[PDB]
Amino acid sequence: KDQEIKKLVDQNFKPLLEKYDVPGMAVGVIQNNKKYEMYYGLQSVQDKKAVNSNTIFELGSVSKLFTATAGGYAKNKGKISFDDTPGKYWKELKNTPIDQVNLLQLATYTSGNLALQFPDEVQTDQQVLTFFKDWKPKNPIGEYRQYSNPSIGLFGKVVALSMNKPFDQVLEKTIFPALGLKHSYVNVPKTQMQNYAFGYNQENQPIRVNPGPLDAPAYGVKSTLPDMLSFIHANLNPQKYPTDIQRAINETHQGRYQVNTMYQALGWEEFSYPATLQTLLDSNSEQIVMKPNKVTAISKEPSVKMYHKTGSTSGFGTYVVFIPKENIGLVMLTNKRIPNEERIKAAYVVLNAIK
Ligand SMILES: *[B@]([O])([C][N]S(=O)(=O)[C]C1=[C][C]=[C]C(C([O])=O)=[C]1)OP([O])([O])=O
Numbered sequence: 152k153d154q155e156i157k158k159l160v161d162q163n164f165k166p167l168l169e170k171y172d173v174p175g176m177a178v179g180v181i182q183n184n185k186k187y188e189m190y191y192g193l194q195s196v197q198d199k200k201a202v203n204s205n206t207i208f209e210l211g212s213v214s215k216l217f218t219a220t221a222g223g224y225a226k227n228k229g230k231i232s233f234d235d236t237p238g239k240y241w242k243e244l245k246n247t248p249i250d251q252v253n254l255l256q257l258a259t260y261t262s263g264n265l266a267l268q269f270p271d272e273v274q275t276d277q278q279v280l281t282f283f284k285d286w287k288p289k290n291p292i293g294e295y296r297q298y299s300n301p302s303i304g305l306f307g308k309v310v311a312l313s314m315n316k317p318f319d320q321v322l323e324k325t326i327f328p329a330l331g332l333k334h335s336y337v338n339v340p341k342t343q344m345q346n347y348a349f350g351y352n353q354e355n356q357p358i359r360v361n362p363g364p365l366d367a368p369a370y371g372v373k374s375t376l377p378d379m380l381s382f383i384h385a386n387l388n389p390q391k392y393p394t395d396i397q398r399a400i401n402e403t404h405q406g407r408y409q410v411n412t413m414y415q416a417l418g419w420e421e422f423s424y425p426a427t428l429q430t431l432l433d434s435n436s437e438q439i440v441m442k443p444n445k446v447t448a449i450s451k452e453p454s455v456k457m458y459h460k461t462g463s464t465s466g467f468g469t470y471v472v473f474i475p476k477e478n479i480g481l482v483m484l485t486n487k488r489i490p491n492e493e494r495i496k497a498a499y500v501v502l503n504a505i506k
Contacts, residue, residue, distance in 0.1 A: 156180050159504050160189045163497040164483065168192055173487040174351055175202040177376040182479045182505060184388060186380050194348035194486060197357065207339060207347040207373045208484040209360050211462030213469045214372040216382075216403070218307045219418030221318075221326050221368075222258055223402030227395055230313040233258075237283075237305060240312040249286040249305075256293050257306040259407050259415050261446065263290030265299040269364045279364045290443065296410060297443045300369035307368025318367050329396040331381050335374040337367045347373065348486040350466015355487075358466040370464060376484060383473050383480040386458070404458065408446040410439060414453065415446070419460055423453035424474055428499050435461055435491045459498075461491050470494035472502065479505060 164178045168191055175192035190202040225231050231240070233255040238245035252262045264286065273282050283305065311318035314325070319337040327335045339347050349357035360371065374382075386404075389397045406414035406421045413434045414421035420434055438444065455476045462469035468488040473480030481498045 153182075153185070156182070156187045156505060157189060159501045160187075163500045164189070165191060167485075167489055167493055167497065171487065171489040171493075172355060173485050173489060175206070175348060175486045177202050177206060177208070177482075177484045179376045179380040179383075179482045180479070180501065180505070181380050181383050181387065181473075181481075184384070184478070186377075186384075188376055188380070190376070194346075195357075196349070196351070196355075202348070202486075204375065204377050205334070205346045206484075207334060207336070207343060207375055208469065208486060209348075209350060209370075209464040209467040210372045210374055210379075210469045210484075211360075211370045211464040211467060213460050213462035213471055214368065214370050215303055215462075216418040216460055216471070217322055217326060217372055218303060218310070218368040219258065219403045219416075220330075220396075220399050221321050222254070222306060222310045223399035223417060224326060224329075224395060225310045225313050226402060227398035231310065237309050240309045241283075243280055244283055247284050247286070248288055249283050251288070252292055254306055254309060255407065257302050257309075258417055260296045260299045260302050261293050261408075262288075262299075262302055263292050263295050263297075264288050265297065265302040267297075267299055267441070269301050273364050275364075294445055295443045296408075296415065296446050298440050301365065304365030304369045308365055310368075322367075322372065326396075326399075329393055330385050331392075332374065332378040335372065335378045337371055337373075339373055346375075348467070350464060351487040352465050353488070360464045360466075370462065376482065379471065379482040379484065380480075383471060383482055386473050387475055387478055387480055404456070406449050406453070406456075409449050410444050410446055413439065414449060414456075416458065419458040421453070421456050421458050423451070424455045424457040424476065426457060428496065431459065431495050431499060432492050434459070435495070459495070461494065463488050463491075468494060470498060472498050474502065477502075477506065
């Protein structure tokens with residue numbers, strides 16, 4: 152039976168490489184604590200370098216899952232409360248209007264006035280501070296979800312302040328070692344640069360993510376297939392992990408509010424399992440991703456849950472999904488974007504087929 156996992160991944164993911172002219176793909180499955188790693192194509196077209204277990208990919212918004220995990224960790228060591236406001240940590244925001252939004256509402260995109268991106272002219276530390284000092288509310292605080300890099304980025308910044316370390320070191324020195332990750336990075340060091348894939352844009356030009364304001368907590372982590380499978384393993388089966396990282400992980404699985412069939416957890420999107428294909432696809436509709444939506448309190452608390460997250464950068468696509476009760480999960484990393492719907496569908500067919 153285990154002999155079917157390679158065939159399934161080949162049937163469902165491998166055709167996407169021709170369809171979308173993607174140079175390189177890594178797809179991992181974890182089932183009953185056994186890891187399966189499927190590698191396709193090249194990490195670098197010009198170098199003819201193969202995708203392998205050392206290949207580093209940009210995770211885009213899947214980085215937010217690390218940020219959420221860092222926040223869960225800081226809460227459980229008593230360094231923050233989710234009821235706190237940012238001005239408790241970043242003193243220059245104390246008594247400004249953004250100091251009425253609490254850390255949870257920042258982590259989960261419900262400030263009521265933060266868009267997907269900062270303005271293009273906002274780049275320096277000084278410009279980021281000014282942006283948040285000048286912030287005024289629009290929608291009632293907590294009522295509307297608008298998916299936002301600045302929102303979760305400020306959450307990450309405040310988590311880092313709570314831990315007295317810059318955010319890059321919170322991940323690289325604390326969170327990643329506690330998860331057993333060996334090649335996961337905010338800043339890919341000199342000695343691993345030969346392992347960092349080129350991304351490829353929609354004109355098939357090689358590209359990597361550009362530096363930008365609070366980029367690390369929003370979309371700035373890079374990792375390998377083995378490490379992302381270890382992360383999914385920690386999400387499915389955290390018992391072997393340190394108690395504090397257990398607590399952190401479990402904090403990320405708690406649904407905070409709902410937008411119909413999508414439950415917003417910390418970083419992760421949560422769903423009742425089994426989820427219809429349309430539930431999973433529509434979680435990343437234009438309506439949910441690009442526009443304000445008024446949230447509700449959770450009414451139906453799912454008994455059996457599954458969780459997912461997409462991520463994209465100019466040159467990379469990522470998708471991660473897991474289902475605790477089936478003890479299965481999947482990770483897809485590409486060095487060209489393909490539509491979210493294809494990532495979600497292929498993972499749906501595969502995970503369903505393996506039971
Ligand atoms: B995330 O992957 C956020 N998407 S993103 O495109 O905002 C990431 C990004 C932001 C600024 C610059 C770049 C760059 O230079 O590549 C990338 O979210 P999804 O998958 O929508 O949830």
